[PDB]
Swiss-Prot record, chains A, B:
Reaction catalysis annotation: L-methionine sulfoximine + acetyl-CoA = N-acetyl-L-methionine sulfoximine + CoA + H(+); L-methionine sulfone + acetyl-CoA = N-acetyl-L-methionine sulfone + CoA + H(+)
Known EC number: 2.3.1.-
Annotated residues for binding of substrate: 73-75, 83-85
PROSITE patterns: GNAT
Protein name in the entry: L-methionine sulfoximine/L-methionine sulfone acetyltransferase
Residues given in the record as acetyl-CoA binding sites: 86-88, 94-99, 125
Length: 170, 170
């Protein structure tokens, strides 16, 4: 697969992947599916902030997965920190697309001069925790029963990657 | 001091405390002061969500401190979790107002049917972390350099309290 910036034509594929995660996994703690308009607004909001939306695609242009990041917490002081998301279409798992997407995202974040990338992962998702660990992320939090989905409590694991360790001051 | 729900007449007092924290402390990671309208909007927004705003007041009716809570993360799955804030006027420290406000806030949260209360504390605030530890809060996050203020990086500590540990499922 090849990694590139998402275009409007990729939204339908992104939408399908997102809604599949919503209905079948704990990767996203939302149970209500969204529509195209919702993802179009999201697409525009990201462009407005200069934040990237990447997609793993093939020669045909099918969306095999996507990744992006946005603000983490609503306070001026967290401006050097973003929370990202990586979604691989179910049938494309086990092919390293997650690694390709996250590596590309890390490079864009660093190029944008950001300082820290935060990952919010459901604690039982060993596959995701491992992917992040091998890309430099370190566990920074374990928060039990802070979430819920499918009628059960869920635990959240926080991980983070410092994009510029030598930058001792903002 | 007595603890009661805030009213519109308490906003100027709350505004002063908030803005003083903005300019002189690392309790809130914002460096821009707000105006009364901002607080009035916040006041009405909390009421709409059924979230309380409590004030510690004296015989003269002065706001010696205030506390409240709101959503922690923007996803449906976190609806059982709230993030709180507690501010004591700077001349009223050492008078147990923080404990008084937090204990009252905890009871309100439990009564509203919430599952977890989260505190977001600058890691160097030993006093605040100790106060929360004594109220049953446990450390669940330690994130280096995710914030900044006064031209330096700041570390964030997350602490949490399960309000109803016997509730097996949401
Ligand atoms: C919904 S969740 N388990 O907190 C994951 C959120 C995802 N990283 C996002 O930024 O949309
Ligand atoms: C700005 S901060 N250090 O993340 C504290 C935020 C505070 N708990 C609040 O809810 O507004």
């Amino acid at each position: 697969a090849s990694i590139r910036d998402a275009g409007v034509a990729d939204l339908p594929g992104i939408l399908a992947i997102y809604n599949d995660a919503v209905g079948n996994t704990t990767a996203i703690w939302n149970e209500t599916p969204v529509d195209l308009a919702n993802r179009q607004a999201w697409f525009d909001a990201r462009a407005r902030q200069g934040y990237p939306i990447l997609v793993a695609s093939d020669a045909a242009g099918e969306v095999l997965g996507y990744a992006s990041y946005g603000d983490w917490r609503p306070f001026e002081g967290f401006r050097g920190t973003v929370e990202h998301s990586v979604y691989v279409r179910d049938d494309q798992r086990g092919k390293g697309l997650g690694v390709q997407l996250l590596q590309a995202l890390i490079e864009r974040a660093r190029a944008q001069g950001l300082h820290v990338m935060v990952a919010a992962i459901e604690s039982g998702n060993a596959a995701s925790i491992g992917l992040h660990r091998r890309l430099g992320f370190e566990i920074s939090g374990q928060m039990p029963q802070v979430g819920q989905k499918f009628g059960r409590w869920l635990d959240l694991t926080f991980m983070q990657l410092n994009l510029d360790p030598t930058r001792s001051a903002p």
